[PDB]
Amino acid sequence: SPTQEGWDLTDKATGLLELNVAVNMGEPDNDFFQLRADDLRDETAYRRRIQSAARKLANNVELKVANMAAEMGSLVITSPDAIGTNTADAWNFVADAEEIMFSRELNRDMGTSYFFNPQDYKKAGYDLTKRDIFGRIPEEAYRDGTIQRQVAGFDDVLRSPKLPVLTKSTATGITVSGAQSFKPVAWQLDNDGNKVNVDNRFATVTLSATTGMKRGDKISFAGVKFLGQMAKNVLAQDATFSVVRVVDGTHVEITPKPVALDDVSLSPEQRAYANVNTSLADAMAVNILNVKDARTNVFWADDAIRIVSQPIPANHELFAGMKTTSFSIPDVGLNGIFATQGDISTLSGLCRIALWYGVNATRPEAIGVGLPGQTA
Amino acid sequence: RKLANNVELKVANMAAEMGSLVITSPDAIGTNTADAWNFVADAEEIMFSRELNRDMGTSYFFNPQDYKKAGYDLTKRDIFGRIPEEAYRDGTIQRQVAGFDDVLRSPKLPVLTKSTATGITVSGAQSFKPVAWQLDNDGNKVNVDNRFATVTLSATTGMKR
Amino acid sequence: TTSFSIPDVGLNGIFATQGDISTLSGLCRIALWYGVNATRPEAIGVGLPGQTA
Amino acid sequence: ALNEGQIVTLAVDEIIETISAITPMAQKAKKYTPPAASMQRSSNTIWMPVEQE
Secondary structure (H helix, E strand, O other), X not given: OOXXXXXXXXXXXXXXXXXXXXXXXXXXXXXXXXXXXXXXXXXXXXXXXXXXXXXXXXXXXXXXXXXXXXXXXXXXXXXXXXXXXXXXXXXXXXXXXXXXXXXOOEOOOOOEEEEEOHXXXXXXXXXXXXXXXXXXXXXXXXXXXXOOOOEOOEOEEEEOOOOOEEOOOOOOOOEEOOOEOOOOOOEEEOHHHOEEEOEOOOEEEEEOOOOXXXXXXXXEEEEEEEEOOOXXXXXXXXXXXXXXXXXXXXXXXXXXXXXXXXXXXXXXXXXXXXXXXXXXXXXXXXXXXXXXXXXXXXXXXXXXXXXXXXXXXXXXXXXXXXXEEEEXXXXXXXXXXXXXXXXXXXXXXXXXXXXXXXXXXXXXXXXXXXXXXXXX | OHHHHHHHHHHHHHHHHHOOEEEEOOOOOOOOXXXXXXXXXXXXXXXXXXXXXXOOOOEEEEOHHHHHHHHHHHHOOOOOOHHHHHHXXXXXXXXXXXXXXXXXXXXXXXXXXXXXXXXXXXXXXXOOOOOOEEEEOOOEEEEOOOOOOOOOEOOOOOOOO | OEEEEEOOOOEEXXXXXXXXXXXXXXXXXXXXXXXXXXXXXXXXXXXXXXXXX | OOOOOOOOOOOOOOOOOOXXXXXXXXXXXXXXXXXXXXXXXXXXXXXXXXXXX
């Protein structure tokens, strides 16, 4: 909500603005093979393939979660040098993440989790064991490879094997094209005058060029700083955005919508949602934050990513010919369908394991990525 | 919630603007071996030496950044006892540092911008008297604020509140 | 008008509402009145790290 | 396929809860309320005696 000052607020009442976010679903993920009847005399390959299918589907879910988190994570913590260069740079790096989460006034009530890749986790362990092995913490980092399960202010510090590598961006000299302002809207009018909901997350930016840009690129703008999300106080950290989609040669979609404080075209209830100090100017430079190809660290508030799933009603009577059952995906807590069907003409059968779900980043501003060793 | 945050922001701004006791260091808080403690302890010692009353308690407020650097000071140390390992596992640098009763980080602390004043000199030999009131114009006794003093200088260029 | 309590601080305000019959529209106002005062500025301090210029 | 009437779903009770803020300094600060009637006829000002020396 906004605030005025003083007495005599006549003709200064505001309205009510309620922003909203949509969660959608992807395409079903399948394992699908076929076998002729002569191949079923020995069924060991068939059973082993079914089990491999279960494992692969589960790990695909995990990979999708990791990739969505790394691509959509707006909070970018960078360091010009690798972990291990200094006596507490791993603690410094996690504490940078925690400090940006705190200063932004992001909600962390459900908990915070920090995911290292194995290399950076090993470098944190190296930092711990370069000290005196006296102590529970260095002793566990020596006898085991583990840094403590809580580090800096994070309630969960893990090691993720599937954290993607963020390839370096090749974009150079990118600038905005004309002043652009982005307004918080609950809905907007299409043709026929229907009210259509608007996703508050993304924003489309016209740039001078979008040549070397890709999904997951981390960028910032020259002079644009974060705000405390309630106090609206300017932060020392440049506002960071992740590229969601390169839609043209001159348009890019970025996952936190930049609402500027100094924008005079906003209503007070629109300005109440500001997250950056100033709007995007005409010739303002675009900073490229993934300057060196590196493997990522991901941290979020726990509610930021969700998996939405839908059943596949293949057990309906309308599918009489094919034989369907329930297929349990081992670890990720998802359920799929297992269907089989044979053809008399070719004496061959089909086996389809179908899983339908969708990974959603509800708070991409509460998802962060950490890039160490970002030099040149 | 917004009204609460506004009053907090105002309190922080007034406290930063009105602070008479100034503890400056040539270097940042993360550079030397125990300089965050030294920084808090300088504050505590100037309060003690001046014999200021602090019966209601004392409080130190850090930046999130300066709090992080104090934690880094506690964490870059080779030996891990209760305090360094709490600074590692948590961000905390203990609620009591030096002689202060409460030490904690405040998100809404402002930035103090450098002044461009250079070569400022005092124009006349000026003295100030403790007065409860002074006569003005009409001869009315009007109360005098014991805090503020107005000083003539060579120039106020570059000087701000 | 009713009393409005601001959370986590020792401050109370007012909550006011008023209707308009011509427009069938209301007005809602939350007013908070306060002042921040430093009664002992000699007992308030500032720490300024890295003053090297 | 199946051309039927569409709906739009809003999970109203499922708010996202994006912000968390804390107020240390105003919590630690003293809070004074003078008499209101005397405050009005002043410029909202009260004078406070300092400890004598």
